[PDB]
UniProtKB/Swiss-Prot annotation, chains A, B:
Protein source organism: Severe acute respiratory syndrome coronavirus (SARS-CoV)
Subunit composition and interactions: Homodimer. Interacts with nsp12.
Domain of life where this protein originates: Viruses
Protein name, UniProt field: Viral protein genome-linked nsp9
Gene: rep
Known function: Forms a primer, NSP9-pU, which is utilized by the polymerase for the initiation of RNA chains. Interacts with ribosome signal recognition particle RNA (SRP). Together with NSP8, suppress protein integration into the cell membrane, thereby disrupting host immune defenses.
Coiled-coil residue windows: none
Localization: Host cytoplasm, Host perinuclear region; Host cytoplasm; Host endoplasmic reticulum
Domain Nsp9 ssRNA-binding as annotated: residue spans: 10-122
Length: 122, 122
């Protein structure tokens, strides 16, 4: 379970869990059927603020998240993939890291430095 | 020893050690006498690219690094401090995190997410 420390003004930084849940990505909103990736997020003013998708496919383009109210669903658009490989039982794998479109430059960093040591485990 | 994964184009990300060395910070370039903080860096095109300073003082403002040639010295300017506290033998401490002035918004993030789990160890 990844983390990232959050800055509570007056310049006070404090460790905040980098959450993960499974989701149904695809090339099309429509092609979003079964779950194929993992979503990394934080709950922001508006509950649930996903940042990146970790997946075994590099084919993805959109992600599907049913609203945290049971109201409807939210379809977020993905950026191009980021390939890297980590040791996995049954063989090492190339996981693709998808940064949600428009993902902040700091947030962008935040994750990259947050799971950096995770990818390095051999 | 902290880390951060580095992106080698064609979108390939790869774990890269987030290095640390001690340094002599102070309020003045001049006041930079004995070592009082730890510097986090990466070797970039121009060897040695420090990003942040971890220190027990919140008084710092400048840092001193003798050139990686034995030529001279480089005085980098620090940004305002970032207080947080972590468990330490002999009592928990408030360490101050100083981001070098002009530190990129991604690099900014990179470190924050890189030592996030480090600060959370109780």
């Amino acid at each position: 379970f990844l983390e990232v420390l959050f800055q509570g003004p007056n310049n006070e930084l404090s460790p905040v869990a980098l959450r993960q849940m499974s989701c149904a990505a695809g090339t099309t909103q429509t092609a979003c059927t079964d779950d194929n990736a993992l979503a990394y997020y934080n709950n922001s003013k508006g509950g649930r603020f996903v940042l990146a998708l970790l997946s075994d496919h590099q084919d993805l383009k959109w992600a599907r998240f049913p609203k945290s109210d049971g109201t409807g669903t939210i379809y977020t658009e993905l950026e191009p993939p980021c390939r890297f490989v980590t040791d996995t039982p049954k063989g090492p794998k190339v996981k693709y890291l998808y940064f949600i479109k428009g993902l902040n430059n700091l947030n962008r960093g935040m994750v990259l430095g947050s799971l950096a040591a995770t990818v390095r485990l051999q």
